[PDB]
Design a protein around this motif. Structure first.
Motif, PDB file in Angstrom:
ATOM      1  N   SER A 283       0.801  -1.218   0.000  1.00  0.00           N
ATOM      2  CA  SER A 283       0.000   0.000   0.000  1.00  0.00           C
ATOM      3  C   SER A 283       0.838   1.275   0.000  1.00  0.00           C
ATOM      4  CB  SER A 283      -0.990  -0.025   1.159  1.00  0.00           C
ATOM      5  OG  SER A 283      -1.715   1.188   1.265  1.00  0.00           O
ATOM      6  N   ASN A 286       2.967   1.462  -3.236  1.00  0.00           N
ATOM      7  CA  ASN A 286       2.085   1.876  -4.334  1.00  0.00           C
ATOM      8  C   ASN A 286       1.698   3.352  -4.213  1.00  0.00           C
ATOM      9  OD1 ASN A 286       2.152  -0.630  -5.632  1.00  0.00           O
ATOM     10  ND2 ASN A 286       0.047  -1.202  -5.165  1.00  0.00           N
ATOM     11  N   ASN A 311      -4.460   7.007  -2.905  1.00  0.00           N
ATOM     12  CA  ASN A 311      -4.641   5.868  -2.000  1.00  0.00           C
ATOM     13  C   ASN A 311      -4.067   4.697  -2.793  1.00  0.00           C
ATOM     14  OD1 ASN A 311      -7.076   7.761  -1.609  1.00  0.00           O
ATOM     15  ND2 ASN A 311      -7.483   6.358   0.093  1.00  0.00           N
ATOM     16  N   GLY A 312      -2.800   4.339  -2.575  1.00  0.00           N
ATOM     17  CA  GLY A 312      -2.169   3.271  -3.354  1.00  0.00           C
ATOM     18  C   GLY A 312      -2.174   3.599  -4.834  1.00  0.00           C
ATOM     19  N   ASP A 313      -2.791   2.747  -5.655  1.00  0.00           N
ATOM     20  CA  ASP A 313      -2.907   2.954  -7.108  1.00  0.00           C
ATOM     21  C   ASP A 313      -4.157   3.773  -7.495  1.00  0.00           C
ATOM     22  OD1 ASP A 313      -4.538   0.717  -6.358  1.00  0.00           O
ATOM     23  OD2 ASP A 313      -4.101  -0.423  -8.189  1.00  0.00           O
ATOM     24  N   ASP A 314      -4.979   4.157  -6.496  1.00  0.00           N
ATOM     25  CA  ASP A 314      -6.190   4.964  -6.682  1.00  0.00           C
ATOM     26  C   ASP A 314      -5.734   6.449  -6.733  1.00  0.00           C
ATOM     27  OD1 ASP A 314      -8.884   5.940  -6.618  1.00  0.00           O
ATOM     28  OD2 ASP A 314      -9.206   5.425  -4.486  1.00  0.00           O
ATOM     29  N   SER A 363     -16.093   4.524  -6.658  1.00  0.00           N
ATOM     30  CA  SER A 363     -16.607   5.519  -5.718  1.00  0.00           C
ATOM     31  C   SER A 363     -16.759   6.947  -6.277  1.00  0.00           C
ATOM     32  CB  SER A 363     -15.737   5.544  -4.475  1.00  0.00           C
ATOM     33  OG  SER A 363     -16.546   5.749  -3.334  1.00  0.00           O
ATOM     34  N   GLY A 405     -18.138  -4.105   6.470  1.00  0.00           N
ATOM     35  CA  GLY A 405     -17.225  -3.054   6.030  1.00  0.00           C
ATOM     36  C   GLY A 405     -17.989  -2.014   5.228  1.00  0.00           C
ATOM     37  N   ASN A 406     -18.919  -2.484   4.347  1.00  0.00           N
ATOM     38  CA  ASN A 406     -19.770  -1.634   3.515  1.00  0.00           C
ATOM     39  C   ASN A 406     -20.774  -0.788   4.306  1.00  0.00           C
ATOM     40  OD1 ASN A 406     -18.725  -1.788   0.908  1.00  0.00           O
ATOM     41  ND2 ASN A 406     -19.669  -3.794   0.584  1.00  0.00           N
ATOM     42  N   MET A 409     -18.333   2.006   6.080  1.00  0.00           N
ATOM     43  CA  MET A 409     -17.775   2.967   5.137  1.00  0.00           C
ATOM     44  C   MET A 409     -18.833   3.691   4.324  1.00  0.00           C
ATOM     45  SD  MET A 409     -14.690   2.961   6.124  1.00  0.00           S
ATOM     46  CE  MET A 409     -13.589   3.658   4.911  1.00  0.00           C
ATOM     47  N   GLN A 441     -12.670  -5.469   6.793  1.00  0.00           N
ATOM     48  CA  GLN A 441     -11.487  -4.721   6.394  1.00  0.00           C
ATOM     49  C   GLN A 441     -11.788  -3.236   6.213  1.00  0.00           C
ATOM     50  OE1 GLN A 441      -9.977  -7.462   3.041  1.00  0.00           O
ATOM     51  NE2 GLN A 441      -8.098  -6.766   4.007  1.00  0.00           N
ATOM     52  N   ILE A 442     -10.974  -2.377   6.823  1.00  0.00           N
ATOM     53  CA  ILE A 442     -11.013  -0.916   6.663  1.00  0.00           C
ATOM     54  C   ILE A 442      -9.631  -0.498   6.150  1.00  0.00           C
ATOM     55  CG2 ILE A 442     -11.278   1.360   7.751  1.00  0.00           C
ATOM     56  CD1 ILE A 442     -13.136  -0.611   9.746  1.00  0.00           C
ATOM     57  N   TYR A 443      -9.561   0.054   4.926  1.00  0.00           N
ATOM     58  CA  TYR A 443      -8.298   0.462   4.268  1.00  0.00           C
ATOM     59  C   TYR A 443      -7.227  -0.664   4.276  1.00  0.00           C
ATOM     60  CZ  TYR A 443     -10.015   5.369   4.081  1.00  0.00           C
ATOM     61  OH  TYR A 443     -10.734   6.501   3.804  1.00  0.00           O
ATOM     62  N   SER A 551      -3.355  -2.677   2.624  1.00  0.00           N
ATOM     63  CA  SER A 551      -3.839  -3.725   1.705  1.00  0.00           C
ATOM     64  C   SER A 551      -2.711  -4.701   1.386  1.00  0.00           C
ATOM     65  CB  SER A 551      -4.424  -3.114   0.433  1.00  0.00           C
ATOM     66  OG  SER A 551      -4.830  -4.108  -0.493  1.00  0.00           O
TER      67      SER A 551
HETATM   68  C1  LIG Z   1     -11.230   5.108  -1.844  1.00  0.00           C
HETATM   69  O1  LIG Z   1     -11.370   5.075  -0.423  1.00  0.00           O
HETATM   70  C2  LIG Z   1     -11.998   3.966   0.117  1.00  0.00           C
HETATM   71  C3  LIG Z   1     -11.277   2.767   0.233  1.00  0.00           C
HETATM   72  C4  LIG Z   1      -9.837   2.616  -0.241  1.00  0.00           C
HETATM   73  C5  LIG Z   1      -9.687   1.472  -1.300  1.00  0.00           C
HETATM   74  C6  LIG Z   1      -8.284   1.290  -1.821  1.00  0.00           C
HETATM   75  C7  LIG Z   1      -7.417   0.390  -1.220  1.00  0.00           C
HETATM   76  C8  LIG Z   1      -6.174   0.122  -1.766  1.00  0.00           C
HETATM   77  C9  LIG Z   1      -5.771   0.756  -2.936  1.00  0.00           C
HETATM   78  N1  LIG Z   1      -4.535   0.440  -3.574  1.00  0.00           N
HETATM   79  S1  LIG Z   1      -3.315  -0.459  -2.990  1.00  0.00           S
HETATM   80  C10 LIG Z   1      -3.809  -2.131  -3.125  1.00  0.00           C
HETATM   81  O2  LIG Z   1      -2.206  -0.248  -3.869  1.00  0.00           O
HETATM   82  O3  LIG Z   1      -3.164  -0.132  -1.605  1.00  0.00           O
HETATM   83  C11 LIG Z   1      -6.620   1.685  -3.528  1.00  0.00           C
HETATM   84  C12 LIG Z   1      -7.860   1.945  -2.971  1.00  0.00           C
HETATM   85  C13 LIG Z   1     -11.895   1.681   0.848  1.00  0.00           C
HETATM   86  C14 LIG Z   1     -13.195   1.775   1.341  1.00  0.00           C
HETATM   87  C15 LIG Z   1     -13.848   0.596   1.969  1.00  0.00           C
HETATM   88  C16 LIG Z   1     -15.148   0.250   1.667  1.00  0.00           C
HETATM   89  C17 LIG Z   1     -15.792  -0.845   2.303  1.00  0.00           C
HETATM   90  C18 LIG Z   1     -15.101  -1.561   3.223  1.00  0.00           C
HETATM   91  N2  LIG Z   1     -13.808  -1.253   3.515  1.00  0.00           N
HETATM   92  C19 LIG Z   1     -13.087  -0.188   2.941  1.00  0.00           C
HETATM   93  O4  LIG Z   1     -11.913   0.017   3.264  1.00  0.00           O
HETATM   94  C20 LIG Z   1     -13.891   2.973   1.217  1.00  0.00           C
HETATM   95  C21 LIG Z   1     -13.324   4.104   0.626  1.00  0.00           C
HETATM   96  C22 LIG Z   1     -14.107   5.441   0.747  1.00  0.00           C
HETATM   97  C23 LIG Z   1     -13.374   6.422   1.687  1.00  0.00           C
HETATM   98  C24 LIG Z   1     -14.315   6.122  -0.612  1.00  0.00           C
HETATM   99  C25 LIG Z   1     -15.514   5.236   1.338  1.00  0.00           C
END
Ligand SMILES: COc1c(CCc2ccc(NS(C)(=O)=O)cc2)cc(-c2ccc[nH]c2=O)cc1C(C)(C)C
Length: 557
Positions: A283, A286, A311-314, A363, A405-406, A409, A441-443, A551
């Motif tokens: 994470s 990335n 957020n990582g690759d986001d 999102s 988780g849903n 969040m 899972q949260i983030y 992640s």
């Molecule tokens: C986008 O934010 C996120 C992200 C972040 C998603 C994310 C994770 C990893 C990466 N990339 S990596 C694998 O390289 O680390 C990119 C995006 C995750 C969640 C989320 C929803 C439901 C349950 N749990 C949660 O965490 C919600 C948002 C909200 C804040 C929009 C609700």
């Protein structure tokens, strides 16, 4: 410079795999179009192998090194600590993959002599040897989706002993470094409410705002040896203990840069030369690499006043517009620069002139009204995948409860409130499982959460307005309604009816269950209650929540 080399040995499962949606007595009350829902299995891993295998070519210019020098200057202000074996053991998830050396995740968490003695010997090995490639297991993830079929995503992880060592050396680094390097651009430091607030303030900070999201095609496989060495040089800018410097150098050379891939049967599948998807630094690595490449690409494309949200690759970019035709040109130059840096696009980026129309990782920002009638911005998403996963979780227990988780969040959303809360609280009442702690899972980090604590958690992340939102947008109502017809989910009027029953059932139980009835289902009754701050919400230890992304990082609390 291939991302992977393969031998022909198959990526094998660990247990029995189901691909077709399991059906029980509860399934039909949620979703009737069962053939639309599937889980990915090791059967499709061969197609994923083909997609993630390509040659990477990098051309590094002066914008890249300029951005890197600035990032390293901020990274040099970070002081990071070494975690003890004990601290690292306690961050290990209870159901984390067992070690090949005769101990499991519960032995690690219990600080068993066998586990702790092995972790100490892996640590000594990282310090004395900085060359030997570290073995990794390659596995096909079992994830649920709705059709229109994706091949299985791959997870690459080292042994449990190595993972505890990664925590010791880098947990404090991956938790504090990104926010120091990227400031307000680092997305994982925000709750969903803080994220909306950041996006609105940024949009309003521009004279003529323009925004887009950038989708890198197979981000992990685009990550080169150079990128991974650059991440290591950033980590090395921190004030670290000399043993932490040595372990970080060793883990980079032996694990992060690449290594052999082993299937669950112990066969050699091949060799990785790209980002491992199941390491502590996935994470953070990335995040820094995406931010570095994007920031340099923004300078190369002469994008005016670019604000990143990474957020990582986001990746989300909000900048000053120069009109639709010039913005189209700028995004093509941005994409060309990202490509030269080995971050080519999947879907090419599209300029947006309405904050609500920017979609990143399914999102988007949307709008509703609180109890006072005030316009309130919140984060939502297309509910197809959450609803497909909810159908699977209706008939099967999973290590990660996506519905929970849903709900956490996406608490303010029309679909999480009316469907997810109604459905799963109805099930938990019937099964007498309201007090049972469930993993979610949260983030990317794993949490154990009691559904009875949901009103307090929601209040702390979103505020009391999450229990009062109404008059959702016609775009949002329409996406939810279309999704229900596609999946064969009962209409929203059915859910309102069922929610009045779930509410009454919760109120009858009294205590924390009655609080759940009161707060989560106030939208369901005609004579609403005035919802006041919950005293238990202030007592909630929500530290460790919204600090960093983990992640693939094997993190529990
Ligand atoms: C986008 O934010 C996120 C992200 C972040 C998603 C994310 C994770 C990893 C990466 N990339 S990596 C694998 O390289 O680390 C990119 C995006 C995750 C969640 C989320 C929803 C439901 C349950 N749990 C949660 O965490 C919600 C948002 C909200 C804040 C929009 C609700």
């Amino acid at each position: 410079h291939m991302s992977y080399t393969w031998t022909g040995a198959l990526i094998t499962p660990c247990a029995a795999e189901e691909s077709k949606l399991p059906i029980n007595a509860l399934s039909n009350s949620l979703l009737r179009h069962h053939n639309m829902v599937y889980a990915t299995t090791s059967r499709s891993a061969g197609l994923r192998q083909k997609k993630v295998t390509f040659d990477r070519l990098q051309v590094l210019d002066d914008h890249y090194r300029d951005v890197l020098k600035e990032m390293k200057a901020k990274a040099s202000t970070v002081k990071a600590k070494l975690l003890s074996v004990e601290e690292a053991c306690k961050l290990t998830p209870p159901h984390s993959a067992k070690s090949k050396f005769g101990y499991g995740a519960k032995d690690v968490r219990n600080l068993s002599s066998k586990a702790v003695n092995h972790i100490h010997s892996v640590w000594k090995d990282l310090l004395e040897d900085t060359v030997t490639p570290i073995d990794t297991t390659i596995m096909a993830k079992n994830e649920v989706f709705c059709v229109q079929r994706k091949p299985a995503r791959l997870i690459v992880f080292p042994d449990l002993g190595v993972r505890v060592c990664e925590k010791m050396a880098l947990y404090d680094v991956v938790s504090t470094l990104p926010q120091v390097v990227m400031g307000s651009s680092y997305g994982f430091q925000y709750s969903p409410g803080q994220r909306v607030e950041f996006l609105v303030n940024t949009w309003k900070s521009k004279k003529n705002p323009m925004g887009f999201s950038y989708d890198t095609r197979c981000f992990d496989s685009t990550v080169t040896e150079n990128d991974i060495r650059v991440e290591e040089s950033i980590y090395q800018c921190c004030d670290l203990a000399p043993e932490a410097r040595q372990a970080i150098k060793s883990l980079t050379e032996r694990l992060y840069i690449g290594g052999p891939l082993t299937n669950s049967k112990g066969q050699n599948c091949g060799y990785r030369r790209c980002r491992a998807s199941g390491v502590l630094t996935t994470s953070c690595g990335n995040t820094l690499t995406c931010y570095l490449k994007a920031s340099a690409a923004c300078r190369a494309a002469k994008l005016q006043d670019c604000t990143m949200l990474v957020n990582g690759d986001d990746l989300v970019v909000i900048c000053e517009s120069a009109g639709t035709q010039e913005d189209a040109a700028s995004l093509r130059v941005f994409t060309e620069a990202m490509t030269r840096y080995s971050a080519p696009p999947g879907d090419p980026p599209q300029p947006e002139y309405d904050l609500e129309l920017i979609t990143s990782c399914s999102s988007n920002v949307s709008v509703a009204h609180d109890a006072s009638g005030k316009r309130v911005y919140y984060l939502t998403r297309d509910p197809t995948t959450p609803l497909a996963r909810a159908a699977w979780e209706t008939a099967r227990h999973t290590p990660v409860n996506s519905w929970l988780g849903n709900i956490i969040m996406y608490a303010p959303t029309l679909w999480a409130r009316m469907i997810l809360m109604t459905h799963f609280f109805s099930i938990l009442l019937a099964q007498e499982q309201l007090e049972k702690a469930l993993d979610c899972q949260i983030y990317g980090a794993c949490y154990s959460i009691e559904p009875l604590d949901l009103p307090q958690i929601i209040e702390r992340l979103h505020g009391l307005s999450a229990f009062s939102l109404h008059s959702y947008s016609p775009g949002e109502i329409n996406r939810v309604a279309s999704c229900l017809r596609k999946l064969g989910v009962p209409p929203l009027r059915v859910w309102r009816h069922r929610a009045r029953s779930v509410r009454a059932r919760l109120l009858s139980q009294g205590g924390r269950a009655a609080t759940c009835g009161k707060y989560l289902f106030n939208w369901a009754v005609k004579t609403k209650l005035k919802l006041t701050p919950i005293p238990a919400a202030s007592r909630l230890d929500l530290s460790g929540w919204f600090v960093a992304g983990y992640s693939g990082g094997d993190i529990y609390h």
